[PDB]
Design a protein around this ligand. Sequence first.
Ligand SMILES: Nc1nc2c(ncn2[C@@H]2O[C@H](COP(=O)(O)OP(=O)(O)NP(=O)(O)O)[C@@H](O)[C@H]2O)c(=O)[nH]1
Ligand SMILES: Nc1nc2c(ncn2[C@@H]2O[C@H](COP(=O)(O)OP(=O)(O)NP(=O)(O)O)[C@@H](O)[C@H]2O)c(=O)[nH]1
Ligand SMILES: [Mg+2]
Ligand SMILES: [Mg+2]
Lengths: 512, 512
Amino acid sequence: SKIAPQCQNLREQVNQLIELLRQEPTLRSQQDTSIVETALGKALSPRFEIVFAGAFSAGKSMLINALLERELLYSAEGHATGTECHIEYANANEERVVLTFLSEAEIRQQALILAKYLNVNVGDLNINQPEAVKVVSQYCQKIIAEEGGENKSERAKQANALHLLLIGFEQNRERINTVQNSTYSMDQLNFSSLAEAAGYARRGANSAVLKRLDYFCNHSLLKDGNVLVDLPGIDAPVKEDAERAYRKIESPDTSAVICVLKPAAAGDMSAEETQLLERISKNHGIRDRVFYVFNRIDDTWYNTQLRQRLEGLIQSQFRDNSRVYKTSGLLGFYGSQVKQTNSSTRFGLDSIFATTIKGFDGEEETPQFVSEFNNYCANSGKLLSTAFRVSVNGYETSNENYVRILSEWGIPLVDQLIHDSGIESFRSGIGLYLAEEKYPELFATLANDLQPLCIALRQFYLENYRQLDSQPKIARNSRLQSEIKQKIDLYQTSIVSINECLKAMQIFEQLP
Amino acid sequence: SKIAPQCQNLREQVNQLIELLRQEPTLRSQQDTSIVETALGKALSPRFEIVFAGAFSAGKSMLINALLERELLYSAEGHATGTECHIEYANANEERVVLTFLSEAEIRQQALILAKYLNVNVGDLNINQPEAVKVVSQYCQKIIAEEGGENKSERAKQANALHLLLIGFEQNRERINTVQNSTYSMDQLNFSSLAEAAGYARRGANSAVLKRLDYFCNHSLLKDGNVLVDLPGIDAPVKEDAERAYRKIESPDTSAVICVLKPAAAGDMSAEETQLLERISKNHGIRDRVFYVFNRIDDTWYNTQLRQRLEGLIQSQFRDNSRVYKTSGLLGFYGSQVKQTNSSTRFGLDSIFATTIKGFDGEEETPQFVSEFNNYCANSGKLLSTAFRVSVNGYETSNENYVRILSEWGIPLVDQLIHDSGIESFRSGIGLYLAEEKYPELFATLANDLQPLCIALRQFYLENYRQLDSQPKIARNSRLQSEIKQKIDLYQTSIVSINECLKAMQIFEQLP
Ligand SMILES: Nc1nc2c(ncn2[C@@H]2O[C@H](COP(=O)(O)OP(=O)(O)NP(=O)(O)O)[C@@H](O)[C@H]2O)c(=O)[nH]1
Ligand SMILES: Nc1nc2c(ncn2[C@@H]2O[C@H](COP(=O)(O)OP(=O)(O)NP(=O)(O)O)[C@@H](O)[C@H]2O)c(=O)[nH]1
Ligand SMILES: [Mg+2]
Ligand SMILES: [Mg+2]
């Protein structure tokens, strides 16, 4: 939210106060000013980066489409998110894709590390020679064949990673700078047809040449300076980009987390996810920020056992009932999309699934939404309590069973679907938290971390001057005492300004 | 299969031949007789242990019930297989459960290792004092609380493991011997009600006090000396019993493997599974034996993307079309069970699901078979090509939708289900391989590994004696030469006996 003028001046006042503390070695050794300086850095809030770190194929990229109620991020079964990605606010005329390339220096360093692990006996990887690129990729292919297949061996996986990296550079030597990280853009006319297509081709390929794709977008969730960050599934075979995902989660460059967790589908927390929770716990202050989201909830509608397991898990480990949500992004995002559709469209079988509908032979094949919409109308869910006499016939195709239903019960029934999936709870909760809670919470935590610091300074000063007053040229002594006393008057002025900022923010845990 | 009398004598002949080789340091250094001795050890075949190593919740225990067409192994979502388990042939009067307990020495060693990792500052873990057991379990509970929940921390997981181990010993100090591994049994009257119930209570609890449960059973797949071994999911939180699973897979105590793989559900091979494939590859000879089984295939009926991914995976990595099978044990095993049921039963809603049907509140809740039977009759599958006008209604309960269908289309339709799931291919293929292929294959591999050994010996002997004959007391020299020549005559006799055994076995790669 926008900054009141006292809160605008507060940066100077807090830096000045920290300098007044640093002046005395006793307080400098006693107190970790860096913590307050970091909390101030957050309070300045040029960004507030929300990280969707979560398990492999847990649907986190889908879930960001659910929060945006728009298709942006590419999403498929298996790995489809092999690169860090950002979404940021921009106005209608400003919507664009901005890439960011690794340099030759980085690509060469990575290729050298891979070759060393592979025991690829090659000298300087002068990939500026297509001949050398050919030789090294032939080595990689030979290794992959001798390992016997792309996942027969860790050596095969790393060889395939090197092979993809080399092919990426060969495709991109026009754009990769030797030392700089080149900036390159896709521009919006038909955002989906041109722009997002050129996006996923540089994303869903998992091409390691990029380290960032930025999307600029109008959706109001972005507008207040909040940046949605997506990350690969931390069970990625490219171990370094998973470790960089940990870097992005851990480093103060970010502080928000959404964890996307399998237990509804998996049945229990995986060691992959407990490692993530430990790494979150290690950060000094994130744990208050962090949310849990259970995804693929729909599988609990079908099985008693998974629903019992998940209930037991939530009531055991996850009492934080304001920070836990159940969702199925696949049903919510398409549900909202389906509400836009029309009967003449065939309810999104054109203009939504039009790519997926064309099968391996190009004939009509069922998009997953339809098979787990029919599995929601028949067989499962709560329609028993509605008026909807929905029924699904095994002598009609999977699409006819959908077109018929939506052609008569449709627009009412889609709201029953959405409110069963619960994305309207999740998007509501984040929409509330990111505007209303987060700005006060960042100022409240700043004031809270300042409170021991200010108490320590007040105690040190008052105990010194009570010691001096209890014990027993005056113009010199008074010049020193009045200079430090005027520093204390500045401390009082700054704390008055901070308390006025907090009062304007309706924060009452004010400083002494 | 039963052993012909030449093949019965072959053990002596092969040991004797190996001694004739060992006599000469040149061959002893040149050749690894231990390989042939191991192949002979397999050829003697007092056991042939088949190991169902495969991913966490990949359904391998279910799949063994599918191979047996009987319930034996406990099975649930999440971990439900926390212990090594064996199934062996016995006759109708002999069917029994045989446990095998860890000793006090092992339990104490494990508890000490855990306490050391936990930094539990306790002396000798004299768990013979219930007071000490109480103190250590209170430490474990306090640690788990400070970590903040059973999967908040690796330290929490290991504390919970120690807590379960201690409670297990407290429950079992009547039966645990201090140094010996106690043997204890459950005996069959109502095998399911008494025996298998007392089984899962010592299995599905994941109580670490046991290291083996043996089941003795009549099913013909066991009868020819083949022992089915089940193992925990190698992504177990108890790292040691996973490493022991690796021990059981790797060590010559076993040689057969069935890998049970998620990619239909997961979308790709996990690093968990590639580690397993590498560990299999490291064993010197298993790789010819090993089978791949894709399980949770049914999810590919619903999604085009998973079916395409799995087809691409199989055609890339898994050309071994006689060693790859697609299955869904959940549909096959219950399908065969359902065929036994009757309409008055309500087709297994009594006498099969009678435990599961009683919900958390005891009311009727849907067993997973019914929800992914209705999802197979409606919406998915191939019934389009059958006569069956099956339909599923959203205004009727999940059980009424099942009872109605089976009450009119039932017994025909269950065969369409089973032959879609394909368990009748898998059980047929293993049934053929374990009798017909395996016994010849073990003798053929024994003969093949003998063939370099016999060629090396023949070359060494003939090159020595051609050297001597090409160069230039005779009773002494001839006593030596004729003794070694009679050893060569014994070699000829043994190789004649082996070739006669192979001929009786219709094996034609015979020795010179
Ligand atoms: N039934 C169902 N399927 C879901 C749900 N969420 C995700 N999926 C499945 O998973 C896909 C999501 O793809 P994607 O967003 O790339 O998943 P991801 O977690 O980002 N994969 P990665 O680990 O590579 O980052 C969907 O297309 C669908 O197949 C859900 O709530 N229900
Ligand atoms: N739909 C479906 N579910 C299956 C299938 N196979 C297994 N499951 C699910 O997984 C359960 C199998 O439990 P279990 O045999 O204990 O699995 P596991 O792989 O042995 N678990 P663990 O890793 O602890 O050894 C079934 O009850 C069902 O919920 C399948 O083919 N289809
Ligand atoms: Mg993804
Ligand atoms: Mg299991």
